[PDB]
């Protein structure tokens, strides 16, 4: 994407479970990452 | 090596500057805040 980069390290299995979701949905791992981010941010009004 | 793999995810500024603000109120790194944004998300896929 554009805008502001992230350089987070996460648990190896997490990644995988994020890579299998991204497959299943026809997204990339960034896409699904933004998904969880925006979903988090939505929780916090 | 608890953590380990790196992500590079290009996200809007708004999500960026705003995640930052949550961190400072939970006292966390910008990075903690995502780690759980992600974990919760992965939890909510059963």
Instruction: Mark yes or no for CB contact A7/B7 under 8 Å.
Output: yes
Chain A environment of B16 (Cβ under 8 Å): 3-4
Output the 3-class SS for chain A. CCCECCCCEECHHHHHHHHHHHHHHCCCHHHHHHHHHHHHHHHCC
Secondary structure letter of residue B2 according to DSSP:
-
What is the C-alpha to C-alpha distance for residues B2 and A45, in angstroms, rounded to an integer?
31
Output the 3-class SS for B4-46. CEECCCCECHHHHHHHHHHHHHHCCCHHHHHHHHHHHHHHCCC
CATH code for the structural domain at B1-46 = 1.10.1220.10
Q: Where are the domains of chain B?
A: 1-46
Q: Method of determination?
A: X-ray
CA end-to-end span of chain B: 25
Q: Are B27 and B36 in contact (CB under 8 A)?
A: no
Any idea which fold A1-45 has?
Arc Repressor Mutant (1.10.1220)
């Amino acid at each position: 994407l554009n805008g502001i980069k992230l350089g987070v390290y996460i648990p190896q299995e997490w990644h995988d479970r994020l890579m299998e979701i991204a497959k299943e949905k026809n997204l990339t791992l960034s896409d699904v990452c933004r998904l969880a981010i925006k979903e988090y941010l939505d929780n916090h009004d």
